[PDB]
Write a protein that binds this DNA or RNA. Sequence first.
RNA 1: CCUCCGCAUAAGCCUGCGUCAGAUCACACUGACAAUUAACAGCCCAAUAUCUACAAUCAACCAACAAGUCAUUAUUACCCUCACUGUCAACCCAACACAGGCAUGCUCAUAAGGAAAGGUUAAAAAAAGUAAAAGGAACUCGGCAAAUCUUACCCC
RNA 2: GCUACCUAAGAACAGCUAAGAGCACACCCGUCUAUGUAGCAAAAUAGUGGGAAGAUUUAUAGGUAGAGGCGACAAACCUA
RNA 3: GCUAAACCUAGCCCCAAACCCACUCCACCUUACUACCAGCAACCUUAGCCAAACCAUUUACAUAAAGUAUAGGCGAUA
Lengths: 158, 109, 96, 26, 189, 41, 176, 43, 111
Amino acid sequence: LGQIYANNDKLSKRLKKVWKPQLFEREFYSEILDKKFTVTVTMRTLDLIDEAYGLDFYILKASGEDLCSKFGMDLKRGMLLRLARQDPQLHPEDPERRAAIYDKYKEFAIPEEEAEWVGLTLEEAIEKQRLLEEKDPVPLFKIYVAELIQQLQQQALS
Amino acid sequence: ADRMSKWTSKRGPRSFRGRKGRGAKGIGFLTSGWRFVQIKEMVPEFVVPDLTGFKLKPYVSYLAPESEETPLTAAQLFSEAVAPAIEKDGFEPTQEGKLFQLYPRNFLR
Amino acid sequence: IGIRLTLPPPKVVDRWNEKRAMFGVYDNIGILGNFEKHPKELIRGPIWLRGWKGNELQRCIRKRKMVGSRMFADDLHNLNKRIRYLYKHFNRHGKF
Amino acid sequence: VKKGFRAAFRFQKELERQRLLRCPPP
Amino acid sequence: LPPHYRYGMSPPGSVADKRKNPPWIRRRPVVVSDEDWYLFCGDTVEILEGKDAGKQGKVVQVIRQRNWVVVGGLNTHYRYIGKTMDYRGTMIPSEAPLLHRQVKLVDPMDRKPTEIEWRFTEAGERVRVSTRSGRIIPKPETWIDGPKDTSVEDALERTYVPCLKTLQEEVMEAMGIKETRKYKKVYWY
Amino acid sequence: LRNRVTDRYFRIQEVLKHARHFRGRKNRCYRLAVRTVIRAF
Amino acid sequence: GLEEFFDDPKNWGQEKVKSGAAWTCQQLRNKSNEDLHKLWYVLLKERNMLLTLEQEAKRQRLPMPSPERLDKVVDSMDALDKVVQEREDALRLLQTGQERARPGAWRRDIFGRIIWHKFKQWVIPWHLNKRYNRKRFFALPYVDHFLRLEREKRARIKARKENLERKKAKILLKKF
Amino acid sequence: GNEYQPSNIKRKNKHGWVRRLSTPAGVQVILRRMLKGRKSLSH
Amino acid sequence: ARNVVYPLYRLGGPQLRVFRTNFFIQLVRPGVAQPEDTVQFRIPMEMTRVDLRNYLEGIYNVPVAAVRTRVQHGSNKRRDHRNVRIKKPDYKVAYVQLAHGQTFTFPDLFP
RNA sequence: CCUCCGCAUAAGCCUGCGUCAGAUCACACUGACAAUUAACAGCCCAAUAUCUACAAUCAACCAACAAGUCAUUAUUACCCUCACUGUCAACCCAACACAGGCAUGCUCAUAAGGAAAGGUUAAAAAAAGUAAAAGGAACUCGGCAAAUCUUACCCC
RNA sequence: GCUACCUAAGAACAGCUAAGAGCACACCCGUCUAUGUAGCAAAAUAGUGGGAAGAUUUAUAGGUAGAGGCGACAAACCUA
RNA sequence: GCUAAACCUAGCCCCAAACCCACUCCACCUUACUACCAGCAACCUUAGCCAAACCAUUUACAUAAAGUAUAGGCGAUA
Ligand SMILES: [Mg+2]
Ligand SMILES: [Mg+2]
Ligand SMILES: [Mg+2]
Ligand SMILES: [Mg+2]
Ligand SMILES: [Mg+2]
Ligand SMILES: [Mg+2]
Ligand SMILES: [Mg+2]
Ligand SMILES: [Mg+2]
Ligand SMILES: [Mg+2]
Ligand SMILES: [Mg+2]
Ligand SMILES: [Mg+2]
Ligand SMILES: [Mg+2]
Ligand SMILES: [Mg+2]
């Protein structure tokens, strides 16, 4: 979003301008995910992918600020998770294949707890945290009982 | 057109007036030809005790002595039913299958 | 009738208060204290003008820079407006 | 309630003078 | 009562007080205490200053908000009362209040006025004690029952057997009410 | 207000003293008095 | 009978009636739930009677005989409510471990101030409730500025309070 | 004169709390009212 | 009971009980000179006709033949030193007919 | 003596000439206390399918045109009954106890509902009305206004 | 909530003569005169008029909003 | 001699310091203050007054270096 001078003389009029990227719609197979994702994909994105060879690689390599999308971030996170867990993407009859795939991306592959949080918004993260430490409140009665038991034990000891 | 005065059932037009009500709380539902259906279960019946042979009057003689106050906490309550525990050396895990639920209250008052 | 009848309660003033008894003490600390501290560090006041004389407009500008970041929305706006006005008045309006 | 004193004093003096003029002593 | 309510001699919900201090007055607040307050209704004080400075008397009333003490029969000034018809009415002596510091507590032995401290004795515990003389200056100060009154026995009978059944269920049990139906689960959120 | 005039009455009176014996508002109202008094002078 | 809404016929037109004290908390605390319930109903009728009497007095242009008694009764009732309620709370704590009965969840409404949204109780789940999804519990960016302003306002008030107190103190010091 | 011809239903539909809450501008209006401390925030 | 959350009755669950009633009432002299057997009470606004009937029958053991409630507007036209509208509270009146030809004249209190 | 107005309902307002007590064109102004009761009117109607060509106009002829306002059926589902709200007033919008504005149903002189004249005098000027000798548009921009009415002809 | 226009679903129009017919009530409007012009009124009263089964009037609820709307153009009306 | 006059203290201003507020019960996004039944959802340069004595490019929004280098209808000014 900017302004242009009319015929590129400053003494001519100034007028606002919106320069849009040339958008597309294209499929991308991702080895780590074993699925074809239709994506809005600019030419620049395609070029980037080509440079990094694999789409998966691009997703991994691309720095979070650089990647530029929530969807992309999510994908990256998913990939990381896959790398971590070592979960069956190709199911049985392809363990060797799976292993090979994994070995492609021995680079990257962060611990499983970190890869959960990767590529999240703030609000989402907060929500997740809340979910993690929600629980039911524990009955006080139980606690009291425990205390009593402890006391009894102590008495026995003495 | 005063908007300091409280909005109420008296204030609007015909269709407005019949909708609102005060904090009355409904006895039933309404159907067919606006025929209202008074359900017995929704109506609260007052469980009044028998006061015949009841010595507790509404006031307490001035001669009665004062004592120090004690907020009845849970610990105290537990203690007052800890004898059985002691003997051993009275709790519900869920109270979903129960008429009188202590947490999401059923019992009125 | 602006003028009044009851002449006021007597304005008692102790000229030897702990404030006035020691007014100016330590003030002048440099020229006889091996110049550890400048007299401008003695003065207690609003941070944007501590040892800094300034001018109306200038003061406003200083306030905006020094403090404006942590300033109350309703007051920051006012300050800005003042600055705008002040510039106009000085840079344009008067004589000479 | 204005902030001064001198003016008040002057006023008082004037009042006194007026009083004297009105009901002078024997 | 509004803010800046000036406490008079009359109580705050009287007719006289209302007349004096309605809701729409706006008097100047009076500048004057602490929890440490050694003067009580019934105590015996010496009047140090003012009309009848020197005299001793009982304390009829205390108004701590105003830091005032009212002394029986003393600091008197005279009030006509009744009246209304065109005649004298009856004549009274009315007691004006004394700001504390004009009053001092009297020693029960010496009878000379004193400054007083609040000290913690071995007796258990807190009490007034003279700073100049010695010893404790203590404190100031049948029924027949009615038809709607319990008695001291009936109040302290104490029938509470501690259970985990609530007021309601136990009440129901006592009644003999039977509820075969079970409560349907509802979404609270 | 920082400083406002306490002594203004006196100034008013100074002129009104000289206007006392004029007819009508010229002797009461300071504004009218001043013009008349100056003229007289 | 309707004679319960009035006191003893002997007491009509005395200007003063003897009523000995309200039920204190501790006494109440020591009685049983069954007993307590019974006591409540006794209290209730008395209260009603008192109210009736008051009304009558108002009608007549006459003062109440012993108005303090009504107050005492009210106090007693309050005490009773507190005791039973306390007990209930304790029971709840013992069983489930919940403060309050009626639940909520600290929900941030449209205006951004966090409400204790007390839950309303009904038949269908929330995701297919027409009138509850339209109830929105989120701010959006325009609200933040207003919140800030509100905060500022609050702070100003606080400052005013504090300064005023200080001034008062100073004045007092000057006086004494 | 006499341009006002009161009808409650109309009023409530026009200026009511619900209508203000429906639009962001309306929300802002309410917020403004709150900030001023006004006693009646909507109609 | 007034100012309490009422439990939900989905279809075939239990009878709603009220142990310990929160609302309380007051019988009054009718100004407009009502007939025999009609007793007039001032009632909290939340109380129903049915509730009133129940309430009388249980606690006072009175045979109620009919109940007719009616809300009464309390006056707003009244102003202060501030010129702020003081409002008298709106309240509910009942007209309760006694059964079996019981009859009731309101007593002369304050004789 | 007026009635170019009345009773209702709708909308609107919301205790705004009811009892007692009180004070200060003439004495609906404050404080307390009463008051409006449901059958009228609001507040409706369990699903899925499936049906609804032939107006209304005393609806009969006629007669049209601008082409219209009042419907089920099949199967499944079902016993619990009258809750809650409005119901006052001399009334609303017009800054006012303001000649204005204000939907519908009855009543079309009223069985409702009101009072044009504080008291005197009877000057001018002004306003509204009635009166008129003889003449009768001579008035005047023009028969404007008025009281009896009706002829002919242009322009647009 | 005025008015401009529209959408939904209502309502009113006597009597006499015989169809965006005539006379003429109720309603709608506002020709001309007079009064009023700090008024009964920030456009009224008295008369006199145009319309009054229709391109009519009108109660209710809704809709279009300003660089715009709406307009049987009068550059009207859009709450004095 | 009437009308009137007069009267300090409510509180407030500017700093400093320190990061605030927010469930007795019940009600409150439906026409808010309403006990009780089957579908949407937020982000998108500021402008113009004004100054240039008109007006079109254009016109600001700790100390010192420094009003320096630069920009600019090479001017206003930045
Ligand atoms: Mg009626
Ligand atoms: Mg008559
Ligand atoms: Mg008359
Ligand atoms: Mg006259
Ligand atoms: Mg003639
Ligand atoms: Mg001629
Ligand atoms: Mg003519
Ligand atoms: Mg016609
Ligand atoms: Mg015609
Ligand atoms: Mg038109
Ligand atoms: Mg034209
Ligand atoms: Mg210019
Ligand atoms: Mg120009």
